Design a binder for these strands. Structure first.
Lengths: 412, 402
DNA sequence: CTGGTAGGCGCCTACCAG
DNA sequence: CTGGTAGGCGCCTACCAG
């Protein structure tokens, strides 16, 4: 019943898109449909950008990599990744000749042995770029290779998940210590944006070979779901990627030449976005909503994640002139990186109560009203998310206010 | 060509010598970019997003899958996605007859999903949803950046980063908008170019005579199309939403109309190759240099230490590096390199890496704070205090923004 | 095509409770 | 004062006869 309130709210406000059946929890978790509407896409982009700054920009010796969405096909009897086949090759064998049974078998066999397949993870792309980046860092360990990109997971249908991956190359001597560093770093990162950071947790695990790792979970209403995995792979995968002379893959550990240990850190950005939507869902606490049996709702997304930083509307006064003021203010805000909802450009009028209820459901951080008073003395009306506040401030100060507000929320 | 060699040595491009040929770079069959090229492409993409969705009126981001539903259309070359287990079953479960194999392949062509070749279908399938968002107010736009898959002349698969804007506008303002976007896109490509004349446009028409245009960059071997703009009309919009036309009508002022569909799509990957070529120039006075535009250059500033105590000198750089990162200024931490090259070797390397500013901290800085600043384009050593470096860099970037 | 009928959108003014 | 709203008006557009 409360799940039906949140998914419905996200659908109504375009955090999510889809039919009612595509919006069930099973469908959302499968990744078989494009889950996000325009506000959800912006939320996921904000989340991705936060991952990149904390995992790449502010980290030492972490470099970006790009790799293809498809990889050379294998002949392993249990490789279940979907294969890419040209329709024109199928049309040739069907329509251009009268194929025998043997030729159709031979065609289908060659499909299995040779055709490309969709990547399941981003790890292979990091391993394949390792020697190139080794030259960049003058062979010095440790360093990392980071990528955000879609991966494919069978579910007769194929789901798509946005994965954020860091592959960390370190001497075995320090691999366990680096694994603990990244685990704490990732757990702190998830928690910093949460209303209820206790709903993010970890649990140690071992893989089929006994290699050590840990997984990160978010406590959804139906149970815990893994959102991140960290593995200490050792140097197994690296030697298989580069068979032959080990001198080509040896890095510098101080003055020691060593084949590095490989740590793999991989998080699900799509599921993470779902988590923050659930985590942000609250009953409204402001006096207008609370003194009402309607039980208004608010999404309290963290300011760094909220897709819409500020909404702009007009109050009483000459509409064309007021819209002109809003337009100049919007352009100033956009130029300084502040996303704006241009409510002023609407031609149907709604009450302030209706307007502020909608903006709370959209997680708008601040609502700004431009009125005939603004035309006289430049004062605008500022209301914070889920409050009854009407703070008067000069329109020339709004930009600096919001810039410092977001900076304050960013390094807290 | 020494340019691709330079981009490989400095890790703009990746790959073996064979996949660094012109035909291999244009095909997109390998991941072409090293770490510096990935950042350059990312800067290009952000600049696209800034000028196409952030500052544009009623342009919204759209999300769509890489997979699209399959159809028996005969003129569709897009790759199909096939379960390896279905193939094993038809081959291994029992002895298959010729007819069952034909039936298997036919059913494959008719029913299997396909990898997108363009971002257009994803924008069309989200049209009705976003129409509710804008309260049916036309015009509005749906925008996405994402990888698409193209058949390449065994047959391989090419991957290209496409930046797409699909513009819905009343069929009466179609040409006025198409012309606006064309000028806006050509100006966009030229803002960052050293030789803006090497970007150009040319008109084109499709199989059924629909108006459009293509943008080109003059590579040394000839022109290559980097962006296409199409006035599609409304055939795909009606085919995407078959049935009642009331559900897809937008509001042209007070008029309810079925919108015209414009498609604007540029090749981000070919775009970064274009700018690498455009930036390649000879160094002035006293070697090569890449003079990428300041908004595009991957490395804004490089930090190094001079003669003196290697201990406390590397300490000041980290305090400065973290300050620059906090204000969105990317930094090459040259002071951690233990090889210790000369300044000539260092500046020649930074020039090849397109580093905008080179900063040197020394014991003169330890006793005062006067760092040594060097510009990529105009190579000379200007002195300035360290507490004004960030502010100088942010204002220099803002100047180059517009 | 010209131009008459009628719906209703967008903006304004004024009045009222708090 | 502030915000909600009832009532008025100028004009665009959709239809249709002619």
């Amino acid at each position: 019943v409360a799940r039906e309130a949140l998914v419905d709210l996200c659908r109504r406000r375009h955090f999510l898109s889809g039919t009612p059946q595509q919006l069930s929890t099973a469908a959302l978790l499968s990744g078989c449909h494009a889950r996000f509407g325009p506000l959800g896409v912006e939320l996921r982009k904000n989340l991705a950008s936060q991952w990149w700054s904390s995992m790449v920009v502010f980290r030492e010796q972490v470099f970006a990599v790009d790799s293809l969405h498809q990889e050379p096909g294998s002949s392993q009897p249990r490789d279940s990744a979907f294969r890419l086949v040209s329709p024109e090759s199928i049309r040739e064998i069907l329509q251009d000749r009268e194929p025998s049974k043997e030729q159709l078998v031979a065609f289908l066999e060659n499909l299995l042995k040779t055709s490309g397949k969709l990547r399941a993870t981003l790890l292979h792309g990091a391993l394949e770029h390792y020697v190139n980046c080794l030259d960049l860092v003058n062979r010095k360990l440790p360093f990392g290779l980071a990528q955000i990109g879609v991966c494919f997971h069978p579910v007769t249908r194929v789901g798509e998940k946005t994965e954020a991956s860091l592959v960390w190359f370190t001497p075995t001597r320090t691999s366990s210590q680096w694994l603990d560093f990244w685990l704490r770093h990732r757990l702190l990162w998830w928690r910093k944006f949460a209303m209820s950071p206790s709903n993010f947790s970890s649990a140690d695990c071992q893989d089929e070979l006994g290699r050590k790792g840990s997984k990160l979970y978010y406590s959804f209403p139906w149970g815990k779901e893994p959102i991140e995995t960290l593995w200490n792979l050792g140097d197994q995968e690296l030697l298989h990627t580069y068979p032959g002379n080990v001198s080509t893959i040896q890095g510098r550990d101080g003055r020691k030449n060593v084949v590095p240990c490989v740590l793999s850190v991989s998080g699900d950005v799509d599921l993470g976005t779902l988590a923050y939507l659930y985590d942000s869902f609250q009953l409204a606490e402001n006096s207008f909503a609370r003194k009402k049996s309607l039980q208004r709702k608010v999404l309290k997304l963290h300011p760094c994640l909220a897709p819409i930083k500020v909404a702009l509307d007009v109050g009483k006064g000459p509409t064309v002139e007021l819209r002109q003021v809003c337009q100049g203010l919007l352009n100033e805000l956009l130029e300084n990186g502040i996303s704006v909802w241009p409510g002023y450009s609407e031609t149907v009028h709604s009450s302030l109560e209706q307007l502020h209820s909608k903006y709370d459901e959209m997680s708008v951080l601040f609502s700004v009203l431009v009125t005939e008073t603004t035309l006289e003395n430049g004062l605008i009306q500022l209301r914070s998310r889920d409050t009854t506040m009407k703070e008067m401030m000069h329109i020339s100060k709004l930009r600096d206010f919001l810039v410092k507000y977001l900076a304050s929320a960013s390094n807290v």
